[PDB]
């Protein structure tokens, strides 16, 4: 009777964030796969402004934007170990890195599998620099959240599911460039929340050609 | 001791947010005008990732990104009413609208004063549609924050200082399109925090031609 619905699209690293946050809080939810090429009434009713997934619907009330949903989850299901720190400065730094990930990672990553030529190579270069900036922030910590798996980890880890695809389509190795970020990603995939929520990496690889066709990309 | 330094640029609607938040809290701060064409060592040290103003420096600790700074300010210093609601759902709605403003308003507004031709006319049209969306959200409420002036009001009000400029350089009338949004803006500029923080609309108009030259825009 506390009802939680998640409107989502399986390979979305953004939706993965809200799957993971929910699993971390042990919240039971109803996952509803959406067709973004034939948008459903419920998606169009719940996110009228942007018409995007994920949408988290809690007792009929929609919360849009994946990072906003992580924070809402953290506040509504509070725990001994919070996803966001209570210290205001440390909270602001977590928000900063979430904002950074939203601004930077996807746009460069998309040029790896979804473009060709000069644009593609410039996208690969920028994507690696962005990862190195994140790897420098992580430093020698277990998680971006320090000893605890937190907001920034959740913000980034959905992208990890696509790393095999980025390596394949960009003919390069992320482990060679960012070994510590790889070690971090392996650690996070050992968590139940993450292992449950991320699709298989090969499934993503298999889907890229179909996805390219659906997005009008000819490669 | 408590030291609050704000690295800023006078006509920035992003920096205006942080000025207004600090004034709502009655905080004593040191405002430090920055030359974005000859960036200072402090700006570069305090915002190494983006190298952008505003930067809020609290006892030597920097906080980057204007909306993040409003939230930090709200958590750190007391006021009669908070800038963000304590209800998680309302808080998430406020975040939603702040994110919407950051994603949409500037990119269209920039085409009004900073472009010519088809691009300019399309920018004016999109800017109007964005304002109408915002005006529908506001509805018949006194503030976006309902009865209390808050986060969303602060997120948008800096752009109000530029409306006379947008109408002049776009040869159009926002009041004709969005009268309730104009009423809102007039109401907010009566708040002492806002009146102290916004430049004179005329000072902005007088600056546009210089600003165009500095940005390499020929009009
Ligand atoms: N900030 C929101 C972002 C949520 C979001 O983007 N949701 C979309 C699906 S997540 S898969 C990544 C996405 N891809 C698409 O949107 C595919 C279709 C789109 N037409 C495209 O060409 O990319 C993406 O990030 N794309 C790039 C871009 O946005 O510039 C979604 O629901 N899309 C529906 C749509 O019609 O676009 C959050 O964090 O929640
Ligand atoms: N999200 C941050 C945004 C803070 C930010 O953009 N700060 C810049 C000053 S605010 S004035 C509007 C700004 N204009 C510029 O950046 C001028 C120079 C720029 N090179 C340009 O041509 O636009 C803006 O919004 N520009 C549009 C854009 O950035 O896409 C700032 O410090 N700029 C420094 C710079 O070198 O760019 C927040 O909310 O705080």
UniProtKB/Swiss-Prot annotation, chains A, B:
The modification Phosphothreonine is found at residue 148. Its main location: cytoplasm. GO terms for biological process: 2,4,6-trinitrotoluene catabolic process; glutathione metabolic process; toxin catabolic process. It comes from the Eukaryota. It catalyses: RX + glutathione = an S-substituted glutathione + a halide anion + H(+). Its EC number is 2.5.1.18. May be involved in the conjugation of reduced glutathione to a wide number of exogenous and endogenous hydrophobic electrophiles and have a detoxification role against certain herbicides. PANTHER family: GLUTATHIONE S-TRANSFERASE U25, GLUTATHIONE S-TRANSFERASE, GST, SUPERFAMILY, GST DOMAIN CONTAINING. This is Glutathione S-transferase U25. The lineage of its organism: Eukaryota, Viridiplantae, Streptophyta, Embryophyta, Tracheophyta. The gene is GSTU25.
